[PDB]
Design a protein around this motif. Structure first.
Motif, short mmCIF file in Angstrom:
data_model
loop_
_atom_site.label_atom_id
_atom_site.label_comp_id
_atom_site.label_asym_id
_atom_site.label_seq_id
_atom_site.Cartn_x
_atom_site.Cartn_y
_atom_site.Cartn_z
N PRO A 52 0.81 -1.22 0.00
CA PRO A 52 0.00 0.00 0.00
C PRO A 52 0.84 1.27 0.00
O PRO A 52 1.97 1.27 0.48
CB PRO A 52 -0.80 -0.12 1.29
CG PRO A 52 0.06 -0.92 2.18
CD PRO A 52 0.79 -1.89 1.31
N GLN A 53 0.28 2.35 -0.54
CA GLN A 53 1.04 3.57 -0.73
C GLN A 53 1.35 4.23 0.60
O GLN A 53 0.59 4.14 1.57
CB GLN A 53 0.26 4.55 -1.61
CG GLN A 53 -0.19 3.98 -2.92
CD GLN A 53 -1.07 4.93 -3.67
OE1 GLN A 53 -1.35 6.03 -3.19
NE2 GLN A 53 -1.52 4.53 -4.84
N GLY A 54 2.49 4.92 0.65
CA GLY A 54 2.88 5.68 1.82
C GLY A 54 3.84 4.98 2.74
O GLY A 54 4.22 5.56 3.76
N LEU A 55 4.24 3.75 2.44
CA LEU A 55 5.13 2.98 3.29
C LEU A 55 6.56 2.96 2.79
O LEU A 55 7.41 2.31 3.41
CB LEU A 55 4.61 1.55 3.43
CG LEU A 55 3.21 1.43 4.03
CD1 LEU A 55 2.89 -0.02 4.30
CD2 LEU A 55 3.12 2.24 5.29
N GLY A 56 6.85 3.63 1.68
CA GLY A 56 8.20 3.63 1.17
C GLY A 56 8.61 2.37 0.45
O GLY A 56 9.80 2.18 0.19
N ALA A 59 8.99 6.50 -4.01
CA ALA A 59 8.85 7.70 -3.21
C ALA A 59 9.34 7.46 -1.79
O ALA A 59 9.66 6.34 -1.39
CB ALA A 59 7.41 8.18 -3.20
N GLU A 60 9.42 8.54 -1.02
CA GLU A 60 9.90 8.46 0.35
C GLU A 60 8.82 7.86 1.25
O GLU A 60 7.78 7.40 0.79
CB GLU A 60 10.32 9.84 0.83
CG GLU A 60 11.07 10.62 -0.21
CD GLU A 60 11.29 12.06 0.18
OE1 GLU A 60 11.58 12.89 -0.70
OE2 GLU A 60 11.18 12.36 1.39
N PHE A 61 9.09 7.85 2.55
CA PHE A 61 8.11 7.37 3.50
C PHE A 61 7.00 8.40 3.67
O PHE A 61 7.25 9.61 3.73
CB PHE A 61 8.75 7.08 4.85
CG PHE A 61 7.85 6.38 5.82
CD1 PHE A 61 7.13 7.09 6.75
CD2 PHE A 61 7.73 5.01 5.80
CE1 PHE A 61 6.30 6.45 7.64
CE2 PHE A 61 6.91 4.37 6.69
CZ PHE A 61 6.19 5.09 7.61
N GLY A 62 5.76 7.93 3.75
CA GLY A 62 4.64 8.81 3.94
C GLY A 62 4.34 9.73 2.77
O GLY A 62 4.00 10.90 2.98
N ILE A 63 4.46 9.22 1.55
CA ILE A 63 4.15 9.98 0.34
C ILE A 63 3.12 9.17 -0.44
O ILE A 63 3.47 8.19 -1.10
CB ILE A 63 5.39 10.26 -0.51
CG1 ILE A 63 6.30 11.27 0.19
CG2 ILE A 63 4.99 10.81 -1.85
CD1 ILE A 63 5.71 12.63 0.28
N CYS A 64 1.86 9.57 -0.35
CA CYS A 64 0.79 8.95 -1.11
C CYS A 64 0.57 9.75 -2.39
O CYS A 64 1.14 10.83 -2.58
CB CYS A 64 -0.49 8.87 -0.29
SG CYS A 64 -0.24 8.47 1.45
N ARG A 98 17.39 11.80 1.93
CA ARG A 98 16.00 11.58 1.47
C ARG A 98 14.89 11.04 2.38
O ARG A 98 13.72 11.20 2.08
CB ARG A 98 16.06 10.70 0.23
CG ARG A 98 15.56 11.39 -1.02
CD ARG A 98 15.84 10.55 -2.24
NE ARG A 98 15.04 9.34 -2.26
CZ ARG A 98 13.77 9.30 -2.66
NH1 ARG A 98 13.18 10.40 -3.09
NH2 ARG A 98 13.11 8.16 -2.64
N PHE A 99 15.21 10.40 3.47
CA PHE A 99 14.22 9.80 4.37
C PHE A 99 13.46 8.67 3.68
O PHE A 99 12.25 8.74 3.47
CB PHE A 99 13.25 10.85 4.92
CG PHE A 99 12.47 10.37 6.11
CD1 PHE A 99 13.04 10.33 7.36
CD2 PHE A 99 11.16 9.96 5.97
CE1 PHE A 99 12.33 9.90 8.45
CE2 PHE A 99 10.44 9.52 7.06
CZ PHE A 99 11.03 9.48 8.30
N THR A 100 14.19 7.63 3.32
CA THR A 100 13.59 6.41 2.82
C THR A 100 13.57 5.37 3.94
O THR A 100 14.04 5.62 5.05
CB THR A 100 14.36 5.89 1.61
OG1 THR A 100 15.76 5.92 1.89
CG2 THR A 100 14.08 6.76 0.41
N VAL A 101 13.01 4.20 3.64
CA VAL A 101 13.06 3.12 4.62
C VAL A 101 14.49 2.64 4.79
O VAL A 101 14.91 2.29 5.91
CB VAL A 101 12.13 1.98 4.19
CG1 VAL A 101 12.29 0.80 5.11
CG2 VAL A 101 10.70 2.46 4.20
N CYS A 139 -2.45 9.41 5.38
CA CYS A 139 -1.21 8.83 4.88
C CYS A 139 -0.44 8.25 6.04
O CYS A 139 -0.45 8.84 7.13
CB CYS A 139 -0.36 9.86 4.14
SG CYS A 139 -0.84 10.15 2.43
N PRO A 140 0.22 7.11 5.87
CA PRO A 140 0.95 6.48 6.97
C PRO A 140 1.93 7.44 7.64
O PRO A 140 2.67 8.17 6.98
CB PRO A 140 1.68 5.33 6.29
CG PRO A 140 0.81 4.99 5.14
CD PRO A 140 0.29 6.30 4.64
#
Lengths: 326, 393, 263, 285, 393, 98, 133
Positions: free
Chosen positions: B267-271, B275-280, E195-198, E232-233
């Motif tokens: 699902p979107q927003g989990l990285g 995209a980065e974390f929390g980006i839907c 970037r703030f990725t996982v 968004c998460p």
């Protein structure tokens, strides 16, 4: 230091070469190194030989590359009184293209370009190609069975003007113009040890008419038998000295005129040959200003050839052959 | 200017005063003498000094710097120019099993030639079908194509000459990056960028195969609450155009849905995606509205002007972003900028067979108001030449 | 035939690296829950070499780049390419050779030094898997040290201390690699090979630092201009440009001790 | 233990290297007098140049310009021309190379700050009539009229605007280096503007709406800029009295440009967050 | 490009030409005359100008700064030289429950001396055991050592004077940086934008003292991706293992709570920790569940293969992520790789002494299904043979 | 109407182009709205909203100034459109600023 | 490496003029109500060079003199030729090269001098239009 050369058969910096002659030229595909080694023989002690017949060399001239390519031969001589010399010869790395025999499987290139047919006629012996002219397209390219890797290239770069020679690194340069890089204005009274200009008239031609046939797909009849012709002219020679050099592939108007202008530059460049011998030992395509007033030269000329010669006694001189100022 | 460039007269007075205090011991200078001319030269030389210093400052400014210096500057900040690309795709060939294969396979698709990208297996598999990753031979945008059937150039024993483009498209083909485009792409990285993630997501989605253009949400797609104030989107949404594969470049939903899954994750927003974390967010497509364009009065112009005007109006309509009106003023400006300002030239936008289409409304003024998730599509440009020319007859 | 002690020969060390790599790398003989990790590490190494080349070429417009880039991409996108030691080693060696042939001298410094840092890590997997990943890292580090030595040799030393510091850096890297390749008798042979290449790089870098230009320290009475110093040392003031790369000090006051070349 | 100082990546620890020794003499060193007398060394030697080169005295007049001291026994020669050439040279260095090297760095630019702002494409959020409504109901520089607010373009004093633009450029250059969006990096970026972001909440948030942050001033003085090559940047105040500048009455008593620029930057940084206020407070010096 | 310091001889030729044309009316510059010296002097001025110009422009290039112009011009952007860092580890003290505890404690391990790096409670816990995160007093790699039993330097009433390090693992010591190790890490932090990725969180959490590896959540954990009214998460949870430090590689809640307060923040959610603004999370540990593996039919394989299978099974079960089933298929497939397809080799998973454990179930296929916030830890692998075969004889 | 939601550089360019186009208008020539819209459609692009209006100062009557049905200013001979003031305004809400 | 100080080198100034021309001439980036004027100025300059060549050749009969004249017309007839800086500069530079190669020495004086008088004016337009002219 006057020191020009330092040869390396592989890393062995030649320190015994009793003489040397290095020739580079645009009229051909290669060059010709010729070293002279001493090679003593004491008929009681052990002696060692070098059977190179292929071991690779270069000639850094005056702290700069000049040649790249003892492949030629070994020529151990003898005599009673001045014997025990070894003449080594070394052509340019673009040689097997000269002494081989094409071994491409198909033989029929279809819907290709001259560049491509040249890339596959070379990459059978690992000679990187310095393509710096253009891309010309041609439908039918059938190589005569096992002709020669160099005849076929020369044929494919003559019907579309492209000088084919070799650089100092060890590559094949297919150019259409000059190598830029202008240089010393040789003036009579300044450095010319000797000069000889000869602009004859038995090797010129007013009108060059190129004829042929069309080899495209579908084109037949008149449009492939009648039309293709072209008549280029050199408005410098004089009276009507006509000619007809016929064409041998996909005769387009541009193709015709281009083969025509290629030969109209060959004959031109042969109708003023200026051999100069200068003193100390970079001009394989260079242009220079030359001033020889007594023979009326005040013009900018292109060096076609370049020959460095040496011999520990009285030498170190360079012989240039130049290109006409039409 | 960037250094200072003081008032000329003041500079010359200072130079003359220094020369008099030092050399002549405090006395003024005879006009039109050796010292006067010496002073004038110095001045000229100092003027050139000012100039050289100014330009040495300029040669270290991203915006005005020679390309070579520009590339050397950008390599220090992580921006490199984009190289040329070869087209790519899959080819499905068939034949009798067990036949021999070599690395000299070349395929002829339309007018282009293609070659194997991966290593060709030694033998044709026992299934009788081989699917191969294939790249074009010539770099650039010419290798891109939309074809389905092709022939084998080099004939191989036991392998039928007909091959198929597995997928029907050849994406990726692009040309080298120029110096001005690279300059304007480098200068977009140092400057202060608001909503940085939006441009980042767009620049990333542009890398999907056959994605030709990426657009923001058009103007006809804003939104307002009950109170009557604009609402700002909390997600990141935009449009894309596959201009060389589908009709009008509009793709079916499945493709853009896969692009969304690849870009944001599932699902979107989990990285999990790019995209980065929390980006839907969501990548969208559009529905085409067919439009006819009629140019009247174009037979009075020379053939060159007519041809270039038709080309430019076709280009403009084809590149119009989704969710944006196709106004008459824009086409009329396109025609005016070529034909001159005192030329008679009238354009008309109609629907084919005067049929009603969803998401298309013709305002009184003559425009074609286009709702959200829709895009204009050039059906046909027709020119009405009622024999009118420059001299009767 | 005199020797060649002005130049490094990188063929023996590359052959020894090939041997030590193919001995400890076989993604067909490691546990199944680690092959994907090992192979991803290999692809990551090749990606690093690719980025190095793309950053060092820059404004190279000829079609040879245009192909080399396509070859890198065709190698990286494929999946079964790095599952064989032969293909992996060929890709690695050819990548380093292409990265070498793209520039000359100083240009290839920062790039190569970054690579030495990338492969300065160790593997957390165990048994054979860790040995495979460490073989990857060791190959990258040793090839980078060799090619950085070849890069240093292609440019002239501006100061004896500078050439000696560069040699110190490279010799330290090589001794670190030898200690790694000797820790618990992993491979004795690669240890000996590294030791030999280290003594070779020692002779060449030391000769370059002390003898390529024969730098001397002239002692001038009081500081002097650049032009005057050049003219008095050489008898040719146009050589003043040469006295600026080695000496620090304003152009109108260089000295009173001036490093330059022998006369 | 280590004591961490802010950085472009949070709170790293810092250290110091050893004094190496080699650092070419910089602009500060060059003086007309120290290299007017130096150039006398470029002349030849002999009975024509010995005495004059020995009697070369140099003095300073009012406006710098190290001249030669013509005592009442002088002997006009070329030596004084060499003094002249050296003095010039120092002058043209100080007026041509020192600027254009001072202006190429965002942390030392003095006379080219507006150009640097045009490079950084800096747009103000408070100055456009189509501003976002979430930026407040009436920004400090907007006065009220029957049909809504009206922004008033302010022409700050030259020194204050110079200092403000310089600070803005420093902070934009630091931000362009790609920070992570935590609170320490944000505060380090916007530090040159003398403003700090401090949360309002204490309890673990993450369960409540409105995670707001107030802006707090860290000093009442922009650090200025020195055109010279030796000295200290002269500080200027970072605020404006509304009545002194003769502005309309509806505006705030004290207007701070640094606060508005910082608020723009932080509201742009944390836009993707869905729930965040920014409670601005009127701050008197 | 464009302009550069001119060849010395060309510069002087141009100065002489200007001087003779604009001053001396075209007369030649006769050598050894006063104009010869004046021209030489002007040329010298221009040479000094160009050389000084090329000097400072080099002093501002980070690739050639002079170190101290590198420590600034990089402390204005926030890049500072990393100093010599301290070693850190975990100690464990025992005493009479309720004893008074000081803040200035100090532990003696061999030749080193360590101090508490966290807050020391006012009193010893009721259980009698207290674990602490200590750090060395002197920096450098010497702080890294392998010593297990140390003494309490300051005798505290009611507290044992013999403390143990947990695994004799003190990890984290290093030295300072030089001017050349600092060019990189500068001239490289200028090419990359964070970037703030996982990947970023997972590599930041691995910086804690002696964290071998960090895992995401598992299949059997259920994650509340969003916290508070939001679309968004904004939640993120981990699983850290200290393999060579703690038992089974699981640390008690006391340490992972400290890692949480360091990463995500004290008031969680306001960007006070190393995480982005507004993204709460947690670093959760797990509880050990002992499992006993029975390899039925290895005795007949040559001892080398049996030793390999054991050292692979124990290593697979040690590194098993928390909240992940230890299915029988994954164990069988470790034998099929070394033993080949012609061997018979069965694998069984059991609980020690057939006892029930919290958070352990066995699926119908024999899989050890683990409820989450748990982790399968190996108890002992045992080999046995019950099916007869002709492997003997 | 609709320029404030553009980059300040773009607004400055459109203002400096409009102020110069109107100053140089030949006498006795209508200042039409299409000629002004273009000055905006060239730099802002066809994806931006930009409407223009022409009005008399304080909506007063001037000799020789009429307005057509389409909003253009029709001018009689011996009369020339001179610029009083160009004004930027924003009334249509949008998402440019968010 | 002696230098023929007997001679003028025109290549550097020609490349410099090329750069300076292409920096301040972009008839795709100037206001729409001045593009026609700017392009007309360019065409008028090329017409001046054409008239110069025709006044200097005089009694040249060779077919090159017939083709060169045909090329001048063909380039001045077409409309979209000077809308690109490349074509404009190429036309200008080749026109000057032909005007040079048409005569020798004294003959080329008055003609060239007239050109210096024609291009000794300044542009009346404003903004980028004045810069282009």
């Amino acid at each position: 230091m006057i020191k020009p050369m330092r040869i390396f058969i592989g890393g062995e910096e030649l320190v015994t070469y009793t003489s040397a002659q290095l020739q580079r030229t645009k009229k051909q595909m290669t060059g010709s190194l010729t070293v002279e080694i001493f090679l003593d023989y004491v008929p009681t002690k052990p002696t060692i030989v070098n059977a190179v017949r292929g071991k690779e060399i270069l000639v850094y001239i005056m702290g700069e590359l000049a040649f790249t390519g003892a492949g030629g031969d070994v020529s151990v001589n003898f005599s009673k009184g001045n014997g025990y010399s070894v003449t080594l010869t070394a052509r340019g790395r673009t040689k097997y293209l000269i002494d081989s025999s094409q071994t491409h499987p198909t033989g029929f290139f279809k819907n290709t370009s001259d560049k491509k047919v040249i890339e596959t006629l070379v990459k059978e012996h690992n000679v990187v190609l310095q393509w710096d002219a253009e891309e010309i397209d041609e439908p039918k390219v059938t190589l005569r069975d096992g002709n020669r890797i160099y005849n076929e290239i020369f044929e494919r770069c003559n019907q579309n003007c492209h000088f084919a020679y070799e650089t100092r690194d060890g590559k094949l340069l297919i150019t259409d113009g000059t190598n830029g890089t202008v240089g010393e204005d040789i003036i009579l009274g300044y450095n010319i040890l000797d000069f000889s200009a000869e602009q004859s008239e038995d090797q010129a031609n007013s009108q060059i008419t190129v004829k042929g046939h069309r080899t495209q797909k579908g084109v037949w009849g008149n449009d492939a038998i009648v039309q293709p012709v072209q008549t280029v002219a050199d408005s410098w020679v004089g009276a009507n000295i006509p000619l007809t050099i016929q064409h041998y592939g996909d005769a387009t108007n541009e193709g015709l005129q281009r083969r025509a202008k290629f030969e109209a530059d060959r004959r031109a460049a042969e109708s003023k040959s200026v051999s100069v011998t200068v003193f100390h030992v970079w001009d394989i395509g260079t242009v220079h200003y030359v001033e020889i007033p007594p023979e009326g030269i005040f013009d900018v000329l292109e060096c076609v050839s370049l020959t460095y010669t040496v011999d520990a006694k009285s030498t170190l001189e360079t012989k240039l052959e130049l290109a006409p100022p039409p | 200017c960037t250094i200072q460039r003081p008032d000329p007269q003041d500079l010359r007075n200072d130079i003359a005063t220094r020369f008099s205090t030092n050399v002549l011991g405090g006395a003024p200078i005879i006009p039109e003498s050796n010292e006067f001319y010496v002073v004038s030269l110095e001045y000229a030389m100092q003027e050139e000094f000012y100039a050289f210093g100014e330009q040495m400052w300029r040669e270290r400014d991203p915006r005005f710097a020679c390309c070579e210096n520009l590339v050397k500057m950008a390599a220090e900040r992580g921006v490199y120019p984009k190289p040329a690309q070869f087209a790519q795709g899959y080819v499905r060939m068939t034949g009798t099993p067990g036949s021999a294969l070599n690395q000299g396979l070349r395929f002829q698709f339309g007018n282009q030639t293609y070659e194997p990208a991966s290593v060709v297996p030694d033998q044709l598999p026992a299934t009788g079908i081989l699917v191969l990753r294939v790249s074009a031979v010539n770099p650039g945008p010419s290798g891109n194509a939309r074809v389905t059937d092709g022939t084998l150039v080099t004939p191989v024993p036991g392998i039928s000459s007909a091959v198929t483009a597995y997928g029907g498209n050849f994406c990726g083909g692009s040309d080298e990056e120029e110096c001005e485009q690279f300059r304007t792409r480098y200068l977009q990285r140092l400057q202060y960028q608001p909503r940085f993630t939006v441009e980042w997501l767009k620049s990333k989605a542009a890398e999907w195969p056959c994605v030709t253009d990426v657009f923001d949400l058009g103007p006809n797609c804003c939104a307002v609450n009950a109170l009557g104030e604009v609402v700002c989107p909390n997600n990141f949404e935009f449009y894309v155009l596959f201009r060389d594969t589908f009709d009008c470049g509009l793709a079916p939903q499945c493709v853009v849905d896969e692009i969304t899954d690849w870009l944001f994750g599932s699902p979107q927003g989990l990285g999990l995606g790019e995209a980065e974390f929390g980006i839907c967010g969501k990548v969208r497509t559009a529905a085409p509205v067919k439009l006819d364009i009629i140019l009247d009065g174009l037979s009075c112009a020379t053939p060159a002007q007519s041809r270039v005007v038709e080309e430019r109006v076709t280009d403009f309509v084809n590149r119009l972003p989704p969710s944006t009106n196709l106004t008459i003023d824009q086409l009329r400006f396109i025609g005016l900028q070529v034909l001159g300002p005192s030329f008679n030239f009238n354009v008309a936008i109609r629907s084919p067979n005067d049929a009603v289409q969803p998401g298309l409304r013709f305002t009184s003024c003559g425009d074609a108001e286009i709702d959200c998730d829709y895009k204009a599509c050039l059906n046909s440009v027709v020119v009405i030449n009622n024999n009118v020319t420059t001299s009767g007859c | 035939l005199v020797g060649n002690l002005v130049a490094l020969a990188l063929a023996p060390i590359i052959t020894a690296t090939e041997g030590s790599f193919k001995r400890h790398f076989s993604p067909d003989n490691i546990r199944y829950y680690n092959t994907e990790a090992v192979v991803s590490t290999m692809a990551q190494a090749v990606t690093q070499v690719q980025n190095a080349y793309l950053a060092i070429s820059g404004n190279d417009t000829s079609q040879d780049k245009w192909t080399t880039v396509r070859d890198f991409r065709n190698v990286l996108i494929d999946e079964f390419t790095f599952y064989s030691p032969a293909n992996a080693w060929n890709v690695l060696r050819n990548g380093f050779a292409i990265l070498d042939a793209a520039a000359t001298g100083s240009d290839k410094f920062n790039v190569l030094r970054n690579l030495i840092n990338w492969s300065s890590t160790h593997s957390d997997l165990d048994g054979e898997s860790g040995d495979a990943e460490n073989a990857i890292f060791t190959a990258v580090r040793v090839l980078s040290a060799a090619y950085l030595a070849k890069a240093y040799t292609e440019t002239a030393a501006t100061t004896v201390n500078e050439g000696l510091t560069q040699y110190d850096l490279i010799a330290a890297v090589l001794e670190q690699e030898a200690q790694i390749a000797k820790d618990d008798c992993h491979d004795n042979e690669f240890f000996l090979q590294i030791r030999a290449f280290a003594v070779d790089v020692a002779r060449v870098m030391v000769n370059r630092a002390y003898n390529s230009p024969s730098l001397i320290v002239y002692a001038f009475p009081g500081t002097v201009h650049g032009l005057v110093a050049a003219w008095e040392i050489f008898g040719d003031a146009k050589r003043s440009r040469d006295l600026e790369a080695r000496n620090n000090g304003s152009p109108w006051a260089v000295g009173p001790k001036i490093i330059s070349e022998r006369v | 233990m280590n004591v961490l100082i802010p950085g472009i990546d949070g709170m790293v620890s810092a250290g110091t290297l050893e004094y190496t020794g080699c650092c070419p003499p910089s602009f500060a060193d060059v003086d007309e007098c120290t290299l007017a007398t130096a150039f006398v060394g470029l002349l030849p030697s002999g009975p024509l140049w010995d005495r004059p080169k020995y009697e070369a005295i140099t003095t300073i007049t009012e406006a710098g310009n190290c001249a030669a001291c013509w005592t009442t026994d002088h002997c006009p020669t070329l030596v004084d021309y060499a003094v002249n050439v050296g003095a010039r040279l120092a002058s043209v260095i100080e007026r041509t190379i020192w600027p254009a090297v001072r202006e190429s760095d965002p942390f030392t630019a003095v006379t080219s700050t507006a150009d640097w702002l045009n490079r950084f494409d800096w747009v103000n959020c408070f100055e456009t009539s189509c501003r976002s409504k979430e930026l407040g109901e009436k920004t400090p520089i907007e006065y009220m009229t029957d049909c809504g607010p009206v922004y008033v373009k302010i022409t700050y004093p030259p020194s204050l605007q110079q200092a403000f633009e310089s600070a803005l450029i420093k902070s934009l250059e630091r931000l362009s280096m790609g920070i992570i969006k935590n609170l320490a990096a944000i505060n380090f970026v916007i530090e040159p503007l003398k403003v700090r972001v401090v949360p309002v909440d204490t309890t673990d948030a993450c369960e409540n709406e409105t995670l707001c942050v107030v802006l707090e001033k860290t000093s009442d003085f922009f650090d200025g800029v020195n055109a010279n090559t030796c000295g200290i940047p002269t500080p200027v105040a970072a605020y404006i009295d509304r009545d002194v500048m003769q502005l309309p009455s509806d505006l705030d008593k004290y207007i701070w440009p640094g606060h508005m620029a910082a608020e723009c930057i932080v509201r742009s940084l944390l836009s993707h967050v869905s729930r965040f206020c920014l409670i601005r407070t009127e701050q008197a010096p």
